[PDB]
Symmetry: C3
Subunit: 146 residues, 3 copies
């Protein structure tokens, strides 16, 4: 965890984000039960009948939040790990990681809370700043070693 | 592959899971051809006409299985790799990795086989146990290094 | 970046692919605005009214391209990283990585450009060759260390 001074910060923020995605998956399963909206007939028939094999607007929203996480956290997991080893200023580094962690946690709150536009979209942009900063840094760093 | 005693177990289980996802992608393409259900008009027009640009319940099921894999295996790939280096008891470690591998392989069998509830849901929960165990371990380990 | 001779090639191709996915996300947001097709009512109400909470065929296509990237680049990110450390012939290695990079960049061009079948499907198969080559190599390498 100490092979770079930035790596505990990265691993802390990264695993909190993975746990955070795990929390989104739990919430999705609870909305499915409460609105009785199942994607599979074998699920619906178990919970009351085939008419519960149906889509629901609130389940659809949960699925959109999880998908957006996969579009952003998974690249951060690669980028921040590699960036951790480009020996960033460990302050700047956890600033990157913390900005991303705080922005992504805020993103999920704005999506599932149905918060008015443009809250969700602002949080997405903030989180992408450290990632973009990290990807450019890694690119020059790798490019100049070719 | 030996920078930690847990790492061959992790890499073996991890790559089997990646190959397993690759197998799910192959199956999806075969259902699309057999039911003639294409997502894109350029695909449909190539296979018989625009009326084959259509959704199918069995293709939809394949897409749900692949998506659930992305929600779970990809975090395991990060978590199990990092956990491999927290020097777990290499028995416990491959127990984590094997429980996850066996549970996820069982999950895909239950989804695409249309197995009665709650088989698919039980397999998902078993696989998430080692991941949750791994994420908590990594969190304390990184937190205490900050 | 030099802990293996294959690793700069891998990191260069990998981050270009991550940036490439980031570009796909940007394009998706622009199609949503131009066709006025929003997935959330809080978004639609902000851009003209609830009738703009609607699906669009061109937004749907962008989402399919991003999803396919997640199915393929994310495993490459794991596989190519690990393969980088199995000390491949650094020529073969960047050949793997370059074939994947060039194939995946071509895949996105064929999807969003609505190119006639089977262009998109050919590019997907080319990119999967190095990944399959990498996964088999990692599997034997890890299996024989168990
Ligand atoms: N897949 C995204 C691409 C753009 C994006 O990620 N947008 C962010 C901010 S909204 C500009 C979001 O919250 N998208 C919400 C979502 O992906 O459901 C979309 O379909 O909007
Ligand atoms: N995205 C999931 C979140 C919960 C989940 O992963 N459920 C597992 C077990 S069923 C409780 C599953 O198999 N979900 C099936 C699927 O995701 O299609 C869902 O929409 O159900
Ligand atoms: N999820 C894919 C599985 C097969 C695949 O990846 N196909 C490639 C090549 S077409 C054979 C593709 O471009 N699929 C396009 C897409 O996934 O939208 C699908 O639903 O077709
Ligand atoms: C993990 C992130 C936590 C997200 C939980 C939801 C936040 C807002 C609470 C929802 C109130 C009304 C609904 O919609
Ligand atoms: C990789 C995992 C293999 C999944 C293959 C499908 C298993 C069940 C066979 C399907 C029989 C009927 C259908 O539905
Ligand atoms: C990143 C990959 C770039 C993809 C950009 C789109 C390529 C084709 C241009 C689209 C012209 C007509 C539409 O459809």
């Amino acid at each position: 965890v100490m092979s770079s001074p930035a790596l505990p910060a990265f691993l802390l923020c990264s695993t909190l984000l993975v746990i955070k995605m795990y929390v989104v998956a739990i919430i999705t399963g609870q909305v499915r039960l409460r609105k009785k909206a199942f994607a599979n007939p074998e699920d619906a028939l178990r919970h009351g009948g085939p008419q519960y094999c149906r889509s629901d607007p609130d389940v659809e929203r949960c699925l959109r939040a999880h998908r957006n996480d996969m579009e952003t956290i998974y690249p951060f997991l690669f980028l921040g790990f590699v960036y951790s080893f480009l020996g960033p200023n460990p302050f700047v580094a956890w600033m990157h990681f913390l900005v991303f962690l705080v922005g992504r946690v805020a993103h999920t709150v704005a999506y599932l809370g149905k918060l008015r536009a443009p809250i969700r979209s602002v949080t997405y942009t903030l989180a992408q700043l450290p990632c973009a900063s990290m990807a450019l840094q890694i690119l020059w760093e790798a490019a100049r070693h070719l």
